[PDB]
Amino acid sequence: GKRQTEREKKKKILAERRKVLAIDHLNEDQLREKAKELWQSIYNLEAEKFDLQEKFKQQKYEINVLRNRINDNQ
Template sequence: MEKDLTELQTLIEAHFESRKKDEEELINITQWIENRRGERAEQHRTRTEREKERQNKLAEEKARKEEEEAKRKADDDAKKKKVLTSFQCTGFMQRTDKRGGPKKQTEREKKKTILSERRKELNVENLSADKLRETVNKLWKSMRQLEAEKFELQYRYMCQKYEITILRNRVSDHQKNTKGSRSKRGLRK
């Protein structure tokens, strides 16, 4: 009996010791979980702060780029206006004299000079309604005339292009025929 009693006591002590160890492990695990939660919360907070900073930087960069783009466009517009006013104020011969004689012009420059010579300033500030209607009708008629000329030129261009392709085909056919007749002549001799 005593033997059973001592064995039972050792089992009870072993059980309480293992339970004590389990409780200590449980306490350690809960502390680790709490620490980990705190670390994750801190990481999440720093991550959100970094994201906010990044978004702010991107917004500032975008605003800066838009501002630079607006400044660049304003500068380009100012340069264009300056060039156009210089085209309007001076004639072609005056500009070539200043440069030291006529120089070759690019197609763009030619177009600009032609347009500046054709373009007339409209002073519509002091005109009455009837005069405005007259000027609008004149502009409309001139625009219709220009559109008609444009259509005629396009039609003539298409006809000429068609004729050129026909002539090219005839030339190539003629060359093929002459090559074939030459080779046949060489075989007969």
């Protein structure tokens, strides 16, 4: 139950998000432009990965906020 749903939902999401290249036929110039584009894409992904990490930390902080609001409530 839900064993395949989770795994293949995740794989489906990563399939629509990522783009597949028919690398074998790619021409020399094409390897040039595309490896530049792929490196830039990885650059941006790491950029807002770091943003996600930071904002993960702050959302942890607001969890801290709300859980303390709860414990004081007794």
